[PDB]
Amino acid sequence: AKETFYITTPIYYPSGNLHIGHAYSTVAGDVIARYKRMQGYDVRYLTGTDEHGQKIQEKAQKAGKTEIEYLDEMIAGIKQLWAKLEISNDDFIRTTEERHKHVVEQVFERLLKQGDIYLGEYEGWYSVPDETYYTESQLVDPQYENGKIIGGKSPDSGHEVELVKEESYFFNISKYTDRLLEFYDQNPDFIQPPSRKNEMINNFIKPGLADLAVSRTSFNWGVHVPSNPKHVVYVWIDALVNYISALGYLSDDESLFNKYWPADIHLMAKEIVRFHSIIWPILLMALDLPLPKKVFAHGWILMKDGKMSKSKGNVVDPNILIDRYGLDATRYYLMRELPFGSDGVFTPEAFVERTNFDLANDLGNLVNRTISMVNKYFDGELPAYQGPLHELDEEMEAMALETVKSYTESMESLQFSVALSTVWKFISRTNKYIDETTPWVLAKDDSQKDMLGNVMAHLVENIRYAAVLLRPFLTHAPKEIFEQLNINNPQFMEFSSLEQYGVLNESIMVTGQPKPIFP
Numbered sequence: 087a088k089e090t091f092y093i094t095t096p097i098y099y100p101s102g103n104l105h106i107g108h109a110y111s112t113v114a115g116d117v118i119a120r121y122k123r124m125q126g127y128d129v130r131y132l133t134g135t136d137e138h139g140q141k142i143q144e145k146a147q148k149a150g151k152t153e154i155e156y157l158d159e160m161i162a163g164i165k166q167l168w169a170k171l172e173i174s175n176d177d178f179i180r181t182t183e184e185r186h187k188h189v190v191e192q193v194f195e196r197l198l199k200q201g202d203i204y205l206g207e208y209e210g211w212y213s214v215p216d217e218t219y220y221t222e223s224q225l226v227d228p229q230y231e232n233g234k235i236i237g238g239k240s241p242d243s244g245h246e247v248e249l250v251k252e253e254s255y256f257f258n259i260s261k262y263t264d265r266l267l268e269f270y271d272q273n274p275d276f277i278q279p280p281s282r283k284n285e286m287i288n289n290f291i292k293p294g295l296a297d298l299a300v301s302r303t304s305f306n307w308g309v310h311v312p313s314n315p316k317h318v319v320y321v322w323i324d325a326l327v328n329y330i331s332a333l334g335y336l337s338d339d340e341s342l343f344n345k346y347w348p349a350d351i352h353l354m355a356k357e358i359v360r361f362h363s364i365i366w367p368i369l370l371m372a373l374d375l376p377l378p379k380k381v382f383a384h385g386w387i388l389m390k391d392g393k394m395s396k397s398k399g400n401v402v403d404p405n406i407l408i409d410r411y412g413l414d415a416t417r418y419y420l421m422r423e424l425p426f427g428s429d430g431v432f433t434p435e436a437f438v439e440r441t442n443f444d445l446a447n448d449l450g451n452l453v454n455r456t457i458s459m460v461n462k463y464f465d466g467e468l469p470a471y472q473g474p475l476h477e478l479d480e481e482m483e484a485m486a487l488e489t490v491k492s493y494t495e496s497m498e499s500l501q502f503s504v505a506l507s508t509v510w511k512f513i514s515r516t517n518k519y520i521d522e523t524t525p526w527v528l529a530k531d532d533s534q535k536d537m538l539g540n541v542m543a544h545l546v547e548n549i550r551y552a553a554v555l556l557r558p559f560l561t562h563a564p565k566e567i568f569e570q571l572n573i574n575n576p577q578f579m580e581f582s583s584l585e586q587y588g589v590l591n592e593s594i595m596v597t598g599q600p601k602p603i604f605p
């Protein structure tokens with residue numbers, strides 16, 4: 087009955103402590119998941135960790151530990167953070183799990199048996215921090231010896247590349263290039279935003295897709311090729327397979343795979359779009375599998391000196407923000423302050439401005455002001471909604487419905503900051519409604535009691551709209567708001583209860599001890 091929806095985050099390298107950039111992607115994925123569940127979809131939400139390759143082996147070495155004991159410590163920390171952020175992921179995939187490694191072995195042996203993979207020699211350059219191959223001409227700031235280039239830097243990051251010349255299996259991705267372009271034409275929405283698509287076509291596809299080195303013999307940390315055990319599978323081939331291996335693809339139970347694949351959305355930042363939009367669909371074509379419906383690439387959290395990066399160390403730890411300011415404030419800031427298609431700067435001043443003014447004052451004090459007035463003027467018994475009796479009610483009831491409509495448009499196109507600011511236009515206007523109607527003036531005249539009850543009904547109904555719309559974003563405050571107002575019919579917390587204004591048509595006893603909803 088329920089249509090499926092499958093959403094993934096990238097599997098992040100546990101090469102250091104995760105920062106708010108990683109929290110952004112995972113909270114954004116969590117917001118989409120929660121939103122889609124509330125729309126009545128059968129949702130599966132995957133996240134995980136990319137634990138193989140030269141980068142990880144070098145951090146394990148640097149920590150004075152074996153790879154596996156290093157990894158088990160780091161993953162414990164990452165699992166706690168997602169529990170702390172109240173991420174509603176249905177599974178956590180580790181590339182060191184046997185269920186993943188089995189699939190990587192099978193995929194590689196299949197393509198090798200098909201003849202799509204062949205043995206040869208790679209000669210070129212490699213950035214370990216980017217896990218990316220480069221040609222001589224791609225190098226930034228080359229170092230010359232006696233005419234020959236003997237070093238230089240990655241054009242993506244500026245990290246020092248290293249020389250590689252070794253035996254390596256190759257994947258002939260150039261033969262699929264006509265089909266990939268045809269797929270781009272049949273599916274125009276595939277790469278979001280539109281700007282990254284032109285970036286893919288003109289800087290990778292049009293110049294000519296080189297044959298991809300899919301294995302290496304110079305290090306041991308990764309999945310080994312069963313037919314040639316000296317070879318370790320290239321970390322990006324290993325990693326990309328997590329999205330289907332986590333669904334039991336090529337195992338004795340492919341039920342999740344049959345149900346949820348193809349993925350509806352792959353989330354990521356812009357730097358890994360080429361892996362997910364060129365290499366990934368080509369790998370799927372070679373396995374005769376359906377392609378994902380969409381890859382969404384958001385911008386970066388920026389610092390004083392560019393991209394926030396854990397290898398670099400210009401970082402903000404999400405554990406600090408949650409421990410000090412609370413969960414709702416951290417989730418709210420990330421989704422509100424970074425527009426999806428833009429690179430945004432973190433500042434601690436903007437964080438506390440959002441935490442104090444938007445949450446605690448705008449929303450928090452609206453709920454507190456409202457419950458205080460019902461307690462004073464009606465002794466806790468909220469009067470039932472009747473209709474738009476006040477002169478402002480017709481236009482404000484229309485605004486509530488236009489708010490839900492605009493919110494929906496923003497959520498479907500993943501514009502989370504615009505969705506949130508639309509909700510805050512409505513919250514701000516509800517505070518303004520108290521100031522326009524002046525209930526204290528109405529409470530003096532006992533002929534104006536019906537109008538006073540009407541005003542209170544509109545305040546609580548506006549609050550209910552806001553609380554339902556914020557359920558995908560904030561995990562505590564909506565529940566607290568429903569508790570304090572004493573709305574316990576589960577239907578009135580759902581999206582379908584926002585279609586027609588004024589669902590509270592019985593009198594309700596609100597809380598007599600109204601506390602602040604935000605830490």
Ligand SMILES: Nc1ncnc2c1ncn2[C@@H]1O[C@H](COP(=O)(O)OP(=O)(O)OP(=O)(O)O)[C@@H](O)[C@H]1O
Binds near residue numbers: 387393
């Ligand atoms: N500054 C950032 N802003 C937004 N998302 C980010 C940011 N940094 C990392 N991410 C998220 O993590 C993914 C990259 O994972 P990765 O393990 O490479 O993190 P990293 O910070 O780039 O690591 P490293 O510093 O070692 O390169 C991105 O695609 C995105 O989902």
Ligand SMILES: Clc1cn2ccsc2n1
Binds near residue numbers: 097326358
């Ligand atoms: Cl798949 C995949 C691999 N990888 C590495 C960093 S973020 C990411 N997603």
